[PDB]
C-alpha cells in the first residue's frame, strides 16, 4: 500500500540558518505531493503544492523539490515564526493507502538564549482537604530546554511528576513550562521542605518552601 516516510522527526536550526526535510514515497507519486505547516491549536496551512509550487501568499523561503519517490522541503532564513511541525502529503491516489501524510517534522528554532524565571506554589488549603495535593513549579520564558528536579527534604523525587511545555513563542523562540508534583495529603504532611530545581546547561535556579 502507499506509504509516506518523512525524516527526520525533529530538526533544529539557528535563526537565519536552513532546515531540510525529506519525504520518501513507497512508489512513484509523480510529484502529486504537498507540504504543510502547522502550529498547535490551528489547522495545517498549505505551503507547497505540485511538489514545488508555492501556495498563494507563501514566502519563497520555503522551497519544494524532488520527483519519483524522493522529495524535500527546504526552509531558508529561518525565523522564530517558522517554529512549527511540517508534514508532506501524497495526492497521487486515494486507493490502497496506509498513510497519505508523512509522520511530520518538528522544527525547533534556536533564537537568543534566555534564562528561566522560576516560581513555586504550595498547595492551597482547599487542595489538602481533598486528600491529594499538587505542588506547582513554573519556569517562564526560557531557551534552550531545561531539566526540572523535584526534592522533598533533600531527597530527589522520581514519581508523581508531570511536565507540560508550551510550543516555542513565535516572536522570540522561548518556552514556558509547568511542572507538577502530586502526593497524598498524608504523604505531603509527612515532609517539610519542597524544592523545584531548574537546570539549563550547567546553571541551576532553585525555588523552595517549608510546608
Amino acid at each position: 500500500a502507499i506509504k509516506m516516510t518523512q525524516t527526520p522527526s525533529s530538526v533544529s536550526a539557528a535563526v537565519g540558518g536552513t532546515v531540510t526535510i525529506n519525504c520518501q514515497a513507497s512508489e512513484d507519486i509523480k510529484r502529486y505531493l504537498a507540504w504543510y505547516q502547522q502550529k498547535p491549536g490551528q489547522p495545517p496551512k498549505l505551503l507547497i503544492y505540485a511538489a514545488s509550487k508555492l501556495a498563494s501568499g507563501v514566502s519563497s523561503r520555503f522551497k519544494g523539490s524532488g520527483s519519483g519517490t524522493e522529495y524535500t522541503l527546504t526552509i531558508s532564513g529561518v525565523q522564530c515564526d517558522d517554529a512549527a511541525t511540517y508534514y508532506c502529503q501524497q495526492g497521487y491516489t486515494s486507493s490502497n493507502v496506509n498513510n497519505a501524510f508523512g509522520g511530520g517534522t518538528e522544527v525547533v528554532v534556536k533564537g537568543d538564549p534566555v534564562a528561566p524565571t522560576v516560581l513555586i506554589f504550595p498547595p492551597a488549603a482547599d487542595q489538602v482537604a481533598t486528600g491529594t495535593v499538587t505542588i506547582v513549579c513554573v519556569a517562564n520564558k526560557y531557551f534552550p530546554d531545561v531539566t526540572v528536579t523535584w526534592e522533598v527534604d533533600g531527597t530527589t523525587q522520581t514519581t508523581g511528576i508531570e511536565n507540560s511545555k508550551t510550543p516555542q513563542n513565535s516572536a522570540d523562540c522561548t518556552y514556558n513550562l509547568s511542572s507538577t508534583l502530586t502526593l497524598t495529603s498524608t504523604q505531603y504532611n509527612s515532609h517539610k521542605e519542597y524544592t523545584c530545581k531548574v537546570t539549563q546547561g550547567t546553571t541551576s535556579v532553585v525555588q523552595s518552601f517549608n510546608r
Binding site: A34, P43, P44, L46, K53, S94, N98, F101
Partner: protein, 207 residues
C-alpha cells in the same frame, strides 16, 4: 469560501457518531472533500475522501470503520463504532487537481473534537496558586472531561503577563491545566469556563 465542522462531542465506545462538514462558496462537483484527524499531540491521519463524482475511498485502517457521504452543501463522516483510539480533532478539507499538478488541501475547517470515553463529562475543580511589589498568582484547574476549558483573568481585562500551559491528561483519564498571571499591587480572579458541562467557575486568588 469556507468549511466548518460540527458534531464532535463526548461519546461512549460503541455509540455511532456522525460528524458534519458544511461548505460555503464552492461546489462539491468541482472539489473533492477529505476527512483528516489528529489525536492530541500526534500527527495528521487521513481517513478518507469523497470525489466530485461521488466515489468514496478510505484509508486501509479506516475501511468498515467510517462511512462518508455528501449532499450539495455538506459532507458527513459517520464513525460506525467509536473506540478510545478514535479520540481526536476531526478536520474536513477540500482538494482538487489540474492536468498534472495536484493542488493540495488548501481549505480546512477549525476541526471538531471527538472524545470517546466510558466516563461521564465532568466540570473542573479550581484551586488558587499563590506564593509562600509585583506578584504572580495562578489557578490550577483539575479533573475535567472532555476538553477544552477556557481560563481568563478578570474577565479578559488582565492579559499582559498571562501564561496558560497546555493541558495534561491524568491517569484517571481526566484533564488538568494551569494558568499564571503577573500583576502589580484590586481583586484578581480566574474565570474558568467548561462549555461541555454548562459550567463556569470564578475563583478569586488571595495574595
Amino acid at each position: 469560501q469556507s468549511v466548518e465542522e460540527s458534531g464532535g462531542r463526548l461519546v461512549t465506545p460503541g455509540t455511532p457518531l456522525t460528524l458534519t462538514c458544511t461548505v460555503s462558496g464552492f461546489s462539491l462537483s468541482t472539489y473533492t472533500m477529505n476527512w483528516v484527524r489528529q489525536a492530541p499531540g500526534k500527527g495528521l491521519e487521513w481517513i478518507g475522501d469523497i470525489y466530485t463524482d461521488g466515489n468514496t475511498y478510505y484509508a486501509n485502517w479506516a475501511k468498515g470503520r467510517f462511512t462518508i457521504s455528501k449532499t450539495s452543501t455538506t459532507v458527513d463522516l459517520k464513525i460506525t463504532s467509536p473506540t478510545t483510539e478514535d479520540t481526536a480533532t476531526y478536520f474536513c478539507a477540500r482538494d482538487s487537481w489540474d492536468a498534472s499538478s495536484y493542488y493540495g488541501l488548501d481549505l480546512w475547517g477549525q476541526g471538531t473534537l471527538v472524545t470517546v470515553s466510558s466516563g461521564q463529562p465532568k466540570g473542573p475543580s479550581v484551586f488558587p496558586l499563590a506564593p509562600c511589589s509585583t506578584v504572580t498568582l495562578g489557578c490550577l484547574v483539575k479533573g475535567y472531561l472532555p476538553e477544552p476549558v477556557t481560563v481568563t483573568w478578570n474577565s479578559g481585562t488582565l492579559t499582559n503577563g498571562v501564561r496558560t500551559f497546555p493541558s495534561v491528561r491524568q491517569s484517571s483519564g481526566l484533564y488538568s491545566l494551569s494558568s499564571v498571571v503577573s500583576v502589580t499591587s484590586q481583586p484578581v480572579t480566574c474565570n474558568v469556563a467548561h462549555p461541555a458541562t454548562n459550567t463556569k467557575v470564578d475563583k478569586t486568588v488571595a495574595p
